Symmetry: D2
Subunit: 461 residues, 4 copies
Amino acid sequence: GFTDYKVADITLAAWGRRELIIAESEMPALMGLRRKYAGQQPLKGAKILGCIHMTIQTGVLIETLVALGAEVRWSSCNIFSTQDQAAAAIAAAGIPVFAWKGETEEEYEWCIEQTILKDGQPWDANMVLDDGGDLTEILHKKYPQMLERIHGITEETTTGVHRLLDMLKNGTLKVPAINVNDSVTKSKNDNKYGCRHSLNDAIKRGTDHLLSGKQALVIGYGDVGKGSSQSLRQEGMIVKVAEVDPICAMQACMDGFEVVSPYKNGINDGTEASIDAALLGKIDLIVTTTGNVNVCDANMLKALKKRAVVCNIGHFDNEIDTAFMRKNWAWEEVKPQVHKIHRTGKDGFDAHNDDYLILLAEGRLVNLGNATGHPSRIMDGSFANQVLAQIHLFEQKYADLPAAEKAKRLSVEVLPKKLDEEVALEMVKGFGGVVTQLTPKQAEYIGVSVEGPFKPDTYRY
Amino acid sequence: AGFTDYKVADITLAAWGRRELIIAESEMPALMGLRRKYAGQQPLKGAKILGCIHMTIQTGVLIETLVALGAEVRWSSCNIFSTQDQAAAAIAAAGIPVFAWKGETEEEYEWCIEQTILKDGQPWDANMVLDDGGDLTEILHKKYPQMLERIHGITEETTTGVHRLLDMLKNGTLKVPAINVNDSVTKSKNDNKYGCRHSLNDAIKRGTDHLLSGKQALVIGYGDVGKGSSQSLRQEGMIVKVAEVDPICAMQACMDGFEVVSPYKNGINDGTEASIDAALLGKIDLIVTTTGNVNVCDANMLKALKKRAVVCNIGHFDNEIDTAFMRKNWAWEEVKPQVHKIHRTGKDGFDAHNDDYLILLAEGRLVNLGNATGHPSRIMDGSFANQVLAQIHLFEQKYADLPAAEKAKRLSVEVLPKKLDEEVALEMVKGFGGVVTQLTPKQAEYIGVSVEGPFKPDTYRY
Amino acid sequence: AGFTDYKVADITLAAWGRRELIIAESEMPALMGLRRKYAGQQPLKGAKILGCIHMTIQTGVLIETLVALGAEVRWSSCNIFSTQDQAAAAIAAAGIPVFAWKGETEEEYEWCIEQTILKDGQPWDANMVLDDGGDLTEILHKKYPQMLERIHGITEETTTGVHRLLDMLKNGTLKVPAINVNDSVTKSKNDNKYGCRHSLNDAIKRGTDHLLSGKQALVIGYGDVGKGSSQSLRQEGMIVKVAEVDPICAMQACMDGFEVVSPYKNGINDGTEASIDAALLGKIDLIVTTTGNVNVCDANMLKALKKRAVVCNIGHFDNEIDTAFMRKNWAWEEVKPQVHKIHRTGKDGFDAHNDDYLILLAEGRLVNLGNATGHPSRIMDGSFANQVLAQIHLFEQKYADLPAAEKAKRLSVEVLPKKLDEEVALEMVKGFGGVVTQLTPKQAEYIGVSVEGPFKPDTYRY
Amino acid sequence: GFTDYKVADITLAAWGRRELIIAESEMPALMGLRRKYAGQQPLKGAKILGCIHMTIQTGVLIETLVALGAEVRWSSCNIFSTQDQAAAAIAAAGIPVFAWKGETEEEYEWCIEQTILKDGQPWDANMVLDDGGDLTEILHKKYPQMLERIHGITEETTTGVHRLLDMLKNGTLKVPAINVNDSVTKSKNDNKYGCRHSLNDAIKRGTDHLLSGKQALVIGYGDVGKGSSQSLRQEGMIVKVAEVDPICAMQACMDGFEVVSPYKNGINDGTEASIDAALLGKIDLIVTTTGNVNVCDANMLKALKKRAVVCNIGHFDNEIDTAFMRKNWAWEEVKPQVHKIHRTGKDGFDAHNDDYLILLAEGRLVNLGNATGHPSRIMDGSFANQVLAQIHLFEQKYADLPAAEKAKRLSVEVLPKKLDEEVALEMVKGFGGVVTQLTPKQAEYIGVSVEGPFKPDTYRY
Ligand SMILES: NC(=O)c1ccc[n+]([C@@H]2O[C@H](COP(=O)([O-])OP(=O)(O)OC[C@H]3O[C@@H](n4cnc5c(N)ncnc54)[C@H](O)[C@@H]3O)[C@@H](O)[C@H]2O)c1
Ligand SMILES: NC(=O)c1ccc[n+]([C@@H]2O[C@H](COP(=O)([O-])OP(=O)(O)OC[C@H]3O[C@@H](n4cnc5c(N)ncnc54)[C@H](O)[C@@H]3O)[C@@H](O)[C@H]2O)c1
Ligand SMILES: NC(=O)c1ccc[n+]([C@@H]2O[C@H](COP(=O)([O-])OP(=O)(O)OC[C@H]3O[C@@H](n4cnc5c(N)ncnc54)[C@H](O)[C@@H]3O)[C@@H](O)[C@H]2O)c1
Ligand SMILES: NC(=O)c1ccc[n+]([C@@H]2O[C@H](COP(=O)([O-])OP(=O)(O)OC[C@H]3O[C@@H](n4cnc5c(N)ncnc54)[C@H](O)[C@@H]3O)[C@@H](O)[C@H]2O)c1
Ligand SMILES: Nc1ncnc2[nH]cnc12
Ligand SMILES: Nc1ncnc2[nH]cnc12
Ligand SMILES: [K+]
Ligand SMILES: [K+]
Ligand SMILES: [K+]
Ligand SMILES: [K+]
């Protein structure tokens, strides 16, 4: 008689369980942490507030934390990212979860609340698991006293890490944090190879468009932009790349991409005259990957080739000026998370109008909105890092430290390279890869232990 | 012409070398941009730079840039097979002391470094060092330690040379401060990776003219050089397998689409023939070592390799392959310069029609420089623009003239600031015709950077 | 008004299907160009076409193009899993008889074909046939031979159907002429290859959401479908091995950078379990059959496959995989529609946490159409423009109206002329924005072609 | 004291022999035929005039032919394609060969002449092996009385095949021929994969230019154009493709290339106004692959980006209007087969002029001119077909038949598919590939013999 959740359809739990069982065979690092740590129960008594995409992969993460002794109460960090059978399976296991695919903003900011409050009172939470920093923000500003019992926050993504480092610089961060993103088994796995898998996947599911031979413009060439560009280029697209970082632009050139700017001479003065109309008039598909604001602006959207696809794979929907398109253009729903944006006006539309754009997931995270996000074997690395980060902070009860000792521990640091390598070895084992052991002679030559770490912290891989 | 302070293979190659020098200048905008940017300031006036790095056309553009800013130099190559004789001829014909030629013996190599160190039998008044691998750096610390009292810094190019400096620094035996030129993003993630992608299959084609598509390759190491080497072979259609001791690099090889294997059963190298995965090695048509380690392609692996397999090394030193074992036990038949068939049938001669042989390239030396020309000019543009920036910073620092307390604080191993790394990258992108977008002021505050950059924290790995 | 001559899953999906048809029209310029050129002339006025091909959004544009040119049609799908229900709904809502839904039983599949053949309990007065796979063609010859007396021709879509036509032709059992639509270059070297490149990994991801990069795949066959399938997996970062019986196709797989292996030791399929390369198959994460042959992934191969490997088929018929053996001996657990875990522990029941299972996609049926949506519109544009041209040509020839003596001289299986193949390609290129260069008169005279084409002899293989 | 030859340096013979022994290990199909037919000696009494690039690969072909009883007198079919160590080894073997790298046009015709005449009188030749049709043309126009003794011609390449068909169409072909080019183990192997290997190889040896990130234009997308485009794209170049054939242009699009024309709207009206100056101003490398005439014309050369590389990989140099460049621009030789073309004027040049183009091999076949052509393991397929074709035509004895019997056999034909398959099988085994054998039921199911042929003659692979 468990009555403490809200999902789309609880009858999907059996289907979710079947896909969870499959996902466990695809996540050896996360499941290896189950077998290695099951005995000592390091999260015994941990009460975790969790806000991250309620997918099948997150379901395995949740059950791993619970299997090690923790209690959790969960919601998604995006309105379109939940897999309804995953949320159903989690609720059926007696775990508080408040998520469904296709939430509104009111239902979104309410689901996060249902995790925060238990019977109208603050849950005795002592850990925070976040993806994007939204949950972290709500606690700091609306319930600032709850954080005096919390031993730390483990943040998943680049946007959340940057926002935390704002507070570390400004002195408003109330607990230490783990930069889970900057583990190599995360940033160079999740952010790059994950988007390589799921970008073209989501574009195919949404539109079924042939990609080979067509022109694409990728905004950004960081970790997500590198994977996004590869996802399209391996499909045969002609991919152009935009960047504000010259180093990332250099890699794009060396990787075989033409580097262009949406603006003449790269200067964005806000006018239509700044737009390279000849370039934008050739683009069949534009993808924003920046984590920045307004990188696909209104003037770009006016200049795009007719029937071009527009989508965002960055964390927030403000990469594209969707607000401009709501106010001025008529939206025609093709199917859930697929809209035709008619540039002829907003007072209705001609069903056979040829001057439209196709927007995916209403500008939200396209891989999770129009598909299922990253596959299990990639998220295995990110969530194994997530569990170890929860272990590191909970075993080092910062909230129980005296005030004088707190200052040395207050930081937003990564995990030690040893843990990063241990996650990597389990991932390599999943592929059947065989890592070579250094001889004692070889380890001395290059100056490392046979047991690692094998690189200085300055190494970039 | 009256000037005899050099030794090259053939001075008459200068005109040919000069013609290729002019072409390479058009391919190196960042280096040429520094030449024009600082010429009116002569930032290297008074600098007397000892240089030890492959005497290619690309190095000549670096050298003539250094001279253009006011420096005097005396140069040698850091490998016996890597010198382009027409590049050395043009440098010597320009009045620049250079001692390098293709096909040096071991003794001539050691002799060439000293001819730069000594002028007219006595030590030259050097004050700067440019080194690639640390051989010249080590020779100064060991055999000419008094010269280091007047030298203001070392700019080290490659990973192996950097490793030696960090050891001396930890030992307290390093005498002058150094700049890690290797770990600039416009060097390590450009030279080491993309350079080997261009030049690895380039060197293999020149040495053997072998079809690479459809054949099996084993790449030991998946660092920057291992990544680029594996891509150089995979893009030609090779079936590439990767070996690694670093599980993080091994994870990247899997995700990049390679099967990760070990030459030893379960990865355990206990020194026995029984430890060799004879089934795996018996399938390999080509083996490339990229680690910067010793004996990663060992004697038992050579015995187990498929007949007529190609063996080469692209790490700095030739000890990655047990070539001493092959010189001792098997007969060498030269096909052509830097290409030898190594007959595994015995020591005393060979059947001219023998089928059981291996092909070793560049006698184990750097195969891209030994059998081809190394990295193209446009890639070395980033690495050598960092060299000029590194030389300027340390020369304008005057370490040898600082107080003792100041000496101790700056006897470090540093890189270049990220701002200069970005400025180098910006010029290379413009060389491709790329256009970098400028942030708006509202966007720059949103992501917490300057509109002018730097755009990433120092922790960023790219 | 009162239209009931159809059977679909859900008529309320019609508005959704109409929206996707309007999108697909913008993606199929060759087919829509044919619709606009010929609509006013009504070249298919009086044509009555029995159609049997995957009731997809793409087929819907084909259907409405034939109708726009004046034909009447009665349609069914040629596979039980390939129908898109919103496409079938939109066609039925347009007043076109269509009998197709996703998830038909074998009984319902036969019934749907019959409902096209029969109108109100008696044979429809059909005079044209459009087929994909030859099922409708076989039923007409075996069960309704009198209907063929009034039929002017068959236009066959795929390789398997063309093989069945040639067997009937040489046995003297083919009653009407046919056009081999498959062997247009804008069909074979477009649909069969690039179409499977797009949709193979698409279907695997939708069915399993498995990571593909770094895993091992075995592709049986290296024809057009096998070439496109191997690329679909290799571009995702899979380690792809290829099996073939044709040495020429095997040679291409090698030159394309794949290792060519056989499921059987030395390639000898002696029917015993001992002939299976257990070590090879114990490493395979994914096996794809692309042959159009029978039992190319047999029971002994399925017993030897690595645990949790995915098994799927993209050839036309499901007998490429011995699924009957798996039905007879192993327990099936449905994950979701067209995704089954097959537990090799026994027939009667299974452990929910059993680790020894295989994942079968689409029950061995066409995986791209079964677990995804088949080829994209812009690719199917080439194939279906050929279909319209073939229907027009055979209908205008009026074979059925000829005397018996004339029918014998006209009875053949033919391909479309190269000139039409080229005009289809030109519209496809314009759809991408490509600009074809025009020969000068001297250039055309130099290579011996007309300025307007055709540009290649009929022997050219492209 | 046999001196019936003409080479550059006979002392290079030992080097050529060392590389010939290696090359023989790379050519199992060619060596396999040499071992198979040695006993019968099918070419005993054959007297072959041979005209094809004197490479190491050609050396293995020549030595095979002589092993079966044939006598040959050899020449190269290009002035720049000879490997001097291969010609030296052949001459050192007592075989008449007249070839060296860097012949003049007058020397080229002299080398053909030296094979045709023996002691100032026509040789009693009865077989012809040709590459490009140069020897075939000289026989018909200058030595017709000798063709009455010739049994057949085996032609290597597309250009020579095209010339054969026009002679047959005009009734001027005097002897039958076998089109070796259109075997699948030659056309879809030599012409495509060979250029994939040797195009970027030649550009690297000629200029040592970085290719990644730069813009390329490939003229043509036939077999050679397909391999050339991949040769550049696999190096990281941004490749655009030009074609007159829309079907080949369709393949370029689907293969992931942007299809463009040097002329506005693809219309070549002969004026400078028709040149797409914007496109050609951004091209760093142009490669002609057509076998047509003047596909990189003077107006295109005027509009090319400064310092762009120009090279041809078709059979003849007239694909580029090199004659215009000789008349109007000053040529500065960088090194053999590498010339700078200064567009500042004809009379002299500034050594530091920036307005130049880099021409490789003076417009001749760039892979053979600046490198070594196709690798040994690729030429194994082409030359195995040549040996089979020589055996078949010599055993037919066309020159002995009466006129009415001649008329029935005077044609240009290809080798049977069964022999095409047997050559491919040996190539596959060279890679260690294992071909699966059909079961009798499978063979019956698809209607082929267990032995093959496995495809109908209409199949395009
Ligand atoms: N959808 C997913 O699966 C997923 C996964 C991880 C991260 N993300 C999100 O994606 C975003 C990017 O993450 P990342 O790890 O790649 O970050 P990153 O900092 O490594 O890369 C972002 C890049 O965008 C560039 N950029 C910024 N503004 C630009 C502009 N106006 N024009 C061009 N380039 C511009 C920056 O120079 C930078 O190189 C973040 O918001 C992150 O949270 C999404
Ligand atoms: N030839 C060239 O053009 C060129 C250019 C740059 C650098 N290099 C040289 O190449 C070497 C590698 O440089 P890098 O930048 O790639 O260094 P790196 O440290 O980034 O990579 C070396 C890798 O080798 C791996 N490794 C070490 N021992 C191993 C073993 N026994 N088996 C398998 N893997 C092993 C390490 O884990 C490491 O990841 C250095 O010596 C450098 O000087 C050559
Ligand atoms: N699903 C789709 O979208 C789609 C599209 C086109 C064709 N098809 C179907 O796919 C099949 C193949 O079509 P295709 O055009 O590629 O035909 P194809 O003749 O060009 O290719 C089949 C290949 O399989 C090889 N083969 C046969 N038996 C084999 C065996 N036992 N082991 C290994 N290889 C073997 C043959 O040598 C041949 O090369 C046909 O049934 C066709 O109808 C499907
Ligand atoms: N260098 C080598 O190694 C090598 C090898 C084989 C063949 N070849 C030669 O290369 C040439 C091409 O051979 P192939 O087998 O590729 O022939 P092909 O017939 O298959 O291809 C030639 C292509 O050029 C296109 N074309 C013609 N005129 C054009 C124009 N003005 N603009 C653009 N495209 C145009 C045609 O449409 C055709 O697709 C022949 O002369 C052949 O002898 C060279
Ligand atoms: N060609 C080259 N010249 C100089 N330094 C190099 N390092 C690698 N390749 C080089
Ligand atoms: N190596 C080679 N030998 C002869 N002809 C060729 N054509 C292309 N490459 C060749
Ligand atoms: K997923
Ligand atoms: K170079
Ligand atoms: K589709
Ligand atoms: K060669």
